[PDB]
């Protein structure tokens, strides 16, 4: 294959003097202008101001200043605010809305020295497992331009898979981080709910950012980059992982869901991952009396999701959800969260697919209820695949999406590693150890 | 009296056994709670058996930061086998089957729970009185109220019954009782400590906007340790070594309420003593949010949260979409405080405008009044001093400052930025040192 520097390797090269911040920034610009043609992932570009910031980083390096991401070029999802840059969420009506202040996540990454070259592609309203909008066009999977690289962080995942930038950052309310990392075969971490501030992830022309279920998290090509970006961006420093190796680790292996289906190639890939951990001293269960009702989980999650996305509004003549019923729904969520608390008293991590299949062909139908999917040559519902993603989003747990391999058509298959709440560093560390075990 | 850490060190050092320390606290309660009526739920039989179990762990060389330390907790927290009523008669015989999260954490650190402390009905008053247990009287003056919601907790601390407590706070429930009784109480950062087990009786409804739980003690060191034990994730420790260079915003006025003379000069005395220790003090700032708009937005959200979104028949309830917009108003107010704490390390202000008032019979706050320097001031408007930390989510420390003309304690409120709960404790400890020249 062809390789690039990771985020940490880039900072190491700049700090060591083998290259400068302006050289790494110019190399990233050239990679974008050379590879983004048939991919169309970096849809907002800030190259002139980025060269100035890289020159400012070289001036800091010269003054013996060292920061974890000093001079490291990166992009961020288009929904995040960067002062002077547009934030449209794909809407043609908000194409010329220019942010006047940097988002919290951008401010934290900048304070650590990161240089932002631009922003990556998204679907309209962030409501799709593709990345296509009338402002910028469509993002194509780098492994197969006929397939979707989407999930709403797809521009971000495509840029990482194409080697344009070593680090990115997305949001996730229905798989928006795990799914693009899965389709494009990169690393994505859905973080614990309320662990990272959503400030600056505003809907265009408002200051409305906070929303239940939704989180933001880092996306990269190595797990160590995820751990660094998480420490830079989290509200407070989260507990570091003490998991030294895989022996004794307790795994719950799920290759089936009561409300959706999975590829036989995906099922075997997840089984191959758990088997590599048994060979490293881990214990793997395939069922537990403490697994919450996943069927009831996705139903409660779906109805809370639709309420949050509609902001409590109902169609014409339809009666809306009352505020009292909303408080009861949040109680239903906390009840499910406690159910996962009992489960994680018996297990350290859940291994399961990110989605039932790999990247699907480009769709022009916005309505998910008017789509379908091809699984092992059979047709299946499209929206039903949300069940694979519901557990971490509804329960609030962190969930890692790490590369496993590829199916028969060369489309990447990823693993979903769900750990208990606030154990985001465990998920990263487990993913790091799983990759090494697969190397053996 | 021995504090929480001192009690753990004394038991570990052979000054007493966990059972002896348990018996000694039971004696202090039965000797002092007569005119106080603070520890209203008692679990002495199981506490002694838990104390004997702690002694076996001590002899087994196990060491935990609160091993064998006897304490109580606010009655609204669930303890397995004890009632949780929130002062309601209907819920007097609601027995919890499992410990609350805070109780479970404190027990895992070795704490021994003797019982629970008194509360008002529904945790909805600045007094502690209910038909199930009676009234709690301020240990400094039996005719004055002991504090609100967490009143039995603060009374037990001021009377030397137990060294550590824990309460909740949605409208000053931790700061006000600590103020009325002259003890330490920490209103923590919102969502920093799990409310699990602080359920409404016979439900699993504990989560609620604005409301937080926090420790209550007699020393700031006990607050920090109790915070580290109970927080969801360990919070950043404080790097503040002294008061030199600290940026303090001194507030003694509010556009919608008022504080009496002794309170105003007590807050200024704390500010001036930090100024003598190297801190810089300001009395105004352009980055100070509109406190009039804040207390209006806060009390609107407070009533909606307490009403669970219900409105009486005839009235139309707040729609869910309007509730979402209200939460955007709070987040907008939180960013406004973010910019304020870029210029200041802490706000110094009263906990309440006056000291502990006489026991009031009137349940309607609108029919109550307060004696402020002989004048008559509206009762409910005093929520203003409480609204900033609750609506903005910041941590707020309530620490002893002194007393007024009648010997009633006056406390200082120390507000720091969100997730700097240890900074608030640390600053409060340095203030206490500065006031002992
Ligand atoms: N029902 C449904 C809605 C949206 C998505 N897109 C997604 O993956 O998350 C979007 C992240 C938005 C953060 O506010 C998928 C399914
Ligand atoms: N994260 C998020 C996603 C979609 C919406 N939906 C919407 O259109 O509300 C815009 C706010 C209008 C305030 O007047 C809101 C937030
Ligand atoms: N309007 C108003 C309501 C309640 C209080 N009592 C208080 O201080 O907090 C109570 C803690 C409840 C935790 O759920 C004061 C004023």
Residue numbers in the entry:
A (entry chain A): 15 to 454
B (entry chain B): 18 to 454
Q: What are the paper's exact sentences on this?
A:
Here, the ligand‐free crystal structure of UMG‐SP2, a metagenome‐derived urethanase with depolymerization activities, at 2.59 Å resolution, as well as its (co‐)structures bound to a suicide hydrolase inhibitor and a short‐chain carbamate substrate at 2.16 and 2.40 Å resolutions, respectively, is reported. UMG‐SP2 belongs to the amidase signature protein superfamily (AS family), which is characterized by a highly conserved GGSS(S/G)GS motif and can be found in bacteria, archaea, and eukaryotes. SP2 shares the domain architecture of amidases, with an α/β‐fold containing 12 prominent α‐helices, 12 β‐strands, and five larger loops. Structural analysis and molecular dynamics simulations reveal that the flexible loop L3 consisting of residues 219–226 is crucial for regulating the hydrolytic activity of UMG‐SP2.
In addition, a SP2 variant with the catalytic triad serine mutated to alanine (S190A) was created and used to solve the complex structure (SP2S190A, 2.40 Å resolution) with the model substrate 4‐hydroxybutyl (4‐(4‐aminobenzyl)phenyl) carbamate (BBC) containing a urethane bond. The structures of SP2S190A and SP2 were solved by MR based on the refined structure of SP2PMS omitting the covalently modified S190. Likewise, when bound to the primary active site cavity of the inactive mutant SP2S190A, the phenyl moiety of the substrate BBC adopts a similar pose as PMS, with the scissile urethane bond in the vicinity of A190 (left inset). The aliphatic 4‐hydroxybutyl moiety of BBC crosses the oxyanion hole and enters a secondary cavity separate from the active site. The hydrophobic residues L140 and I187 bind to the 4‐hydroxy butyl moiety of the BBC ligand and form the secondary cavity of the active site, which partially accommodates BBC. Only one region near the active site of the substrate‐bound SP2S190A, belonging to the loop L3 (residues 219–226, corresponding to the loop L3 also found in UMG‐SP1), has a different conformation than the other structures and the computational model SP2AF2. Upon binding of BBC, K224, and concomitantly the flanking residues A223 and A225 perform a backbone flip that leads to a release of the active site steric blockage and the K224 side chain now points into the solvent as seen in the SP2S190A structure complexed with BBC (right insert). Interestingly, we discovered a second substrate binding site that is only found in the second molecule of the asymmetric unit of the BBC‐bound SP2S190A complex structure. R325, on the other hand, can directly interact with substrate in the secondary site, through the amphipathic part of the side chain or hydrogen bonds, since the guanidine group of R325 is within 4 Å of BBC's carbamate group, both of which are abrogated by replacing R325 with the smaller alanine.
